[PDB]
């Protein structure tokens, strides 16, 4: 699962709302070799600890805007979770342990078209059909 001490943050207003209790809630988890201060994605500034840190955010763009901030503090070990309200913590970033910029094997060409972009079919080819013109199984 997840664990860690929360950073020294004096409370905010841009934090979690009733969506985080009812639908989904994200959690970033990093570790720091320093008692440094960083900028919160929910507005303000907080002091991260020296052990395992743990911060609950509301949506995934707030975690990776924070994850792109820790990479400028030379902290590139963060794990992002997604916490459903029944307690199910899935682990979503980075999925394979490796960052999505550098290539790993076993990964799949998912949502890939084997044509140029300019040779997509016309929307009159797909008239009264279920598919869109960018799905288009020919080439």
């Amino acid at each position: 699962t997840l664990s860690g001490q929360t950073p020294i943050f004096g409370g905010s207003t841009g934090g979690l709302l009733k969506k985080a209790e009812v639908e989904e809630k994200y959690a970033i988890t990093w570790t720091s070799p320093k008692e440094q201060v960083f900028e919160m994605p929910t507005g303000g500034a907080a002091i991260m600890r020296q052990g395992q840190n743990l911060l609950y955010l509301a949506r995934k763009e707030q975690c990776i805007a924070l994850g792109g901030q820790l990479r400028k503090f030379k902290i590139t070990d963060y794990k992002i979770y997604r916490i459903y309200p029944n307690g199910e913590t899935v682990y979503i970033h980075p999925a394979d342990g490796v960052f999505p910029e550098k290539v790993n094997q076993g990964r799949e060409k998912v949502r890939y078209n084997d044509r140029r972009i300019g040779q997509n079919p016309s929307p009159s080819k797909v008239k009264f059909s279920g598919i869109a013109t960018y799905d288009a199984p020919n080439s």
């Binding site: 409370g11 905010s12 207003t13 934090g15 009812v22 309200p85």
Partner: protein
């Protein structure tokens, strides 16, 4: 001092002297919307009566009928009937339409009426509340010349 909301720095509120005082917490949590140990009819009956009583106010002295006396208090009552019919229409319409699988979230405070049998009982309270109050302030306004006398000793 302003600390985070119930000890959670990640929640989006602050434990400020307005929402987390001793006074303003014991005033809000004792208003009939939040008072502990009330059936939802008695919540709505007390919420309604405080609202029918004042809503006849702004139409009997600055309304279109303010020049007369007997017809002024009718147009102030007729207003608070229509304000409180169309508001108690809107909360039967609210509970029909929000309790279908998401009872304000099954998974929490400031909205402790999450059942649809606790809201259909509330709607019966605000209707009979806001029209007992609309009549009590109507019977105290059409009988105002008879109530100026008994509060001045003019009736011996």
């Amino acid at each position: 001092i302003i600390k985070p909301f119930k000890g959670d720095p990640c929640l989006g509120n602050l434990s400020t002297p307005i929402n987390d005082s001793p006074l303003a917490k014991a005033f809000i949590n004792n208003l009939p919307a939040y008072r502990k140990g009330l059936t939802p009819f008695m919540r709505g009956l007390e919420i309604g009566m405080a609202h029918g009583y004042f809503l006849v106010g702004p139409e009997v002295v600055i309304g279109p009928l303010r020049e007369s006396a007997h017809g002024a208090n009718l147009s102030g009552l007729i207003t608070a009937i229509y304000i409180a019919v169309s508001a108690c229409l809107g909360i039967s319409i609210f509970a029909i339409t929000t309790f279908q699988g998401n009872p304000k979230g099954s998974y929490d405070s400031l909205r402790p009426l999450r059942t649809r049998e606790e809201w259909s009982q509330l709607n019966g309270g605000i209707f009979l509340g806001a029209m007992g109050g609309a009549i009590f302030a109507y019977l105290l306004l059409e009988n105002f010349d008879a109530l100026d006398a008994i509060l001045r000793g003019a009736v011996n």
